Scaffold this active site. Structure first.
Site, mmCIF file in Angstrom:
data_model
loop_
_atom_site.group_PDB
_atom_site.id
_atom_site.type_symbol
_atom_site.label_atom_id
_atom_site.label_comp_id
_atom_site.label_asym_id
_atom_site.label_seq_id
_atom_site.Cartn_x
_atom_site.Cartn_y
_atom_site.Cartn_z
ATOM 1 N N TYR B 9 0.856 -1.179 0.000
ATOM 2 C CA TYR B 9 0.000 0.000 0.000
ATOM 3 C C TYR B 9 0.895 1.232 0.000
ATOM 4 O O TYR B 9 2.118 1.125 0.032
ATOM 5 C CB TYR B 9 -0.950 -0.009 1.193
ATOM 6 C CG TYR B 9 -2.057 1.018 1.128
ATOM 7 C CD1 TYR B 9 -2.961 1.026 0.076
ATOM 8 C CD2 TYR B 9 -2.197 1.980 2.105
ATOM 9 C CE1 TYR B 9 -3.978 1.966 -0.001
ATOM 10 C CE2 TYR B 9 -3.216 2.924 2.047
ATOM 11 C CZ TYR B 9 -4.089 2.914 0.994
ATOM 12 O OH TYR B 9 -5.123 3.835 1.004
ATOM 13 N N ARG B 15 -6.627 2.688 3.305
ATOM 14 C CA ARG B 15 -7.404 1.472 3.126
ATOM 15 C C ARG B 15 -6.643 0.218 3.550
ATOM 16 O O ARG B 15 -7.227 -0.863 3.593
ATOM 17 C CB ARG B 15 -7.834 1.360 1.664
ATOM 18 C CG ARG B 15 -8.647 2.541 1.155
ATOM 19 C CD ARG B 15 -8.919 2.324 -0.332
ATOM 20 N NE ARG B 15 -9.287 3.529 -1.065
ATOM 21 C CZ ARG B 15 -10.529 3.987 -1.187
ATOM 22 N NH1 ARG B 15 -11.548 3.356 -0.622
ATOM 23 N NH2 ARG B 15 -10.740 5.110 -1.841
ATOM 24 N N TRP B 105 -10.611 11.563 -2.960
ATOM 25 C CA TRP B 105 -9.217 11.467 -2.536
ATOM 26 C C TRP B 105 -8.257 11.825 -3.659
ATOM 27 O O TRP B 105 -7.206 12.415 -3.415
ATOM 28 C CB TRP B 105 -8.920 10.052 -2.024
ATOM 29 C CG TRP B 105 -9.805 9.617 -0.905
ATOM 30 C CD1 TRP B 105 -10.866 8.768 -0.993
ATOM 31 C CD2 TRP B 105 -9.732 10.035 0.467
ATOM 32 N NE1 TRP B 105 -11.454 8.610 0.239
ATOM 33 C CE2 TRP B 105 -10.791 9.392 1.149
ATOM 34 C CE3 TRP B 105 -8.885 10.892 1.183
ATOM 35 C CZ2 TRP B 105 -11.027 9.579 2.505
ATOM 36 C CZ3 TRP B 105 -9.129 11.081 2.544
ATOM 37 C CH2 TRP B 105 -10.181 10.410 3.189
#
Ligand SMILES: CC(C)(O)[C@H]1CC[C@H](NC(=O)c2ccc3nc(-c4ccccc4)cn3c2)CC1
Ligand SMILES: CC(C)(O)[C@H]1CC[C@H](NC(=O)c2ccc3nc(-c4ccccc4)cn3c2)CC1
Ligand SMILES: N[C@@H](CCC(=O)N[C@@H](CS)C(=O)NCC(=O)O)C(=O)O
Ligand SMILES: N[C@@H](CCC(=O)N[C@@H](CS)C(=O)NCC(=O)O)C(=O)O
Ligand SMILES: [Cl-]
Ligand SMILES: [Mg+2]
Ligand SMILES: [Mg+2]
Ligand code: NA
Ligand code: NA
Ligand code: NA
Lengths: 200, 200
Positions: B9, B15, B105
């Site tokens: 990530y 997330r 975002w």
């Protein structure tokens, strides 16, 4: 005996159709309650959260279309056959839902809405189609060796996308074959024949 | 044998954090691989659906943060204590994720981004907080009699919302209490102490 099941949604396939396919496949009787848009505020006022579909299971009101679908398919043939398969089912479905949920279905300004639909369909949808085709490869179903509710969800999402972009799959015959296989499942074929005809 | 896990990530909670909480709680060793945004263009083509997080396990690639989280919690005491409670867990998580996923975002135009963040926090976050608070009522956890990963996800999502709007929960003491309970769970407290400090 079996539970009383009552599905509430609009008179559309929309986000409820996955549940409708599952009930058909499992041959489970349910009330397919369809509301007019004008009656949404009243229904909403009775719910814990602020969306439909919801599914009443005897005295309990469930929400979230995919939470419900997952619950109904646990311990059935439509679940992934193994724990890892269930992860892949969940992931494919969330990828499809993420994309469908990018469309501004509730945008009240029609010009803004149309521009965004066209952008998503022209520039983003092809990349998802290519990712899905590569993911499927030469296999019969998306996950494992047998049909899952992810295959249903593919057929459902793509049916709506094809309304707006009829050539979406012209370069993806294997994804067309998968749609046709889902559509030829007898319980699904039977539901497709008999369901209310709506654009979406 | 001990599993071989690698999470990929960005260098953010974002997330991936739900997965990181679950690995911490389960005492699972993993590679917490954090890329910078400048690495994104070259990693994108390696991803099944063009998105992160992904989780590699024993040579296999998984995607979709909540699909992964659900997979990791099956057969653990974070899953939900009955099949119906697992449905409730799933529904709460999707309600939270649906809201967080509304935020733009990736919007480039910073003025457009700020306007939309403010709108969501002013006119939509209060409804979600109210609905969650009424659903929780006087109960200890969101679902059932013990903590679930839905409680983790509540704490994670609200932590990020509170970065933007520190006052967001000033009128929901019961939701503050629930956050603090999650944060004091030994595994979670110790993860919070040791994790990389990032804004988001
Ligand atoms: C009452 C109200 C607040 O004004 C509502 C606003 C949303 C609108 N809603 C749609 O018009 C719509 C139509 C079709 C559809 N299909 C999906 C879909 C399909 C498959 C997977 C995921 C999503 C979402 N949709 C939304 C219905 C009225
Ligand atoms: C390189 C690139 C393609 O341009 C990326 C585009 C997305 C962006 N992404 C965010 O900047 C971001 C930051 C924080 C965050 N938090 C959530 C969140 C948290 C909890 C639950 C669900 C979602 C999503 N987020 C996204 C990162 C760069
Ligand atoms: N992720 C949810 C999304 C539900 C959703 O957005 N439903 C829309 C109808 S298509 C709704 O209830 N909109 C009414 C509103 O926002 O007031 C699910 O799949 O159940
Ligand atoms: N529902 C997915 C969403 C994944 C997602 O959108 N991740 C962002 C990072 S925050 C991403 O990969 N963005 C790539 C892009 O916008 O092109 C999940 O939870 O895994
Ligand atoms: Cl510890
Ligand atoms: Mg199966
Ligand atoms: Mg989702
Ligand atoms: Na979403
Ligand atoms: Na693949
Ligand atoms: Na057909």
């Amino acid at each position: 005996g079996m539970p009383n099941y009552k599905l509430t949604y609009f008179n559309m396939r929309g986000r409820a159709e996955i549940i409708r396919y599952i009930f058909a496949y499992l041959d489970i009787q349910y009330e397919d309650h369809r509301i007019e848009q004008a009656d949404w505020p009243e229904i909403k006022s009775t719910l814990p959260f602020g969306k439909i579909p919801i599914l009443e299971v005897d005295g309990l009101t469930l929400h979230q279309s995919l939470a419900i679908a997952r619950y109904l398919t646990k311990n059935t043939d439509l679940a992934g056959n193994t724990e890892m398969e269930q992860c892949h089912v969940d992931a494919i479905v969330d990828t499809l839902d993420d994309f469908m949920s990018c469309f501004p279905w509730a945008e009240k300004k029609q010009d803004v809405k149309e521009q965004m639909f066209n952008e998503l369909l022209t520039y983003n949808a092809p990349h998802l189609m290519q990712d899905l085709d590569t993911y499927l490869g030469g296999r019969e179903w998306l996950i494992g060796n047998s049909v899952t509710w992810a295959d249903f969800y593919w057929e459902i999402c793509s049916t709506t996308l094809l309304v707006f972009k009829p050539d979406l799959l012209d370069n993806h015959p294997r994804l067309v074959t998968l749609r046709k296989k889902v559509q030829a499942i007898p319980a699904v074929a039977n539901w497709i024949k008999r369901r209310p005809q709506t654009k979406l």
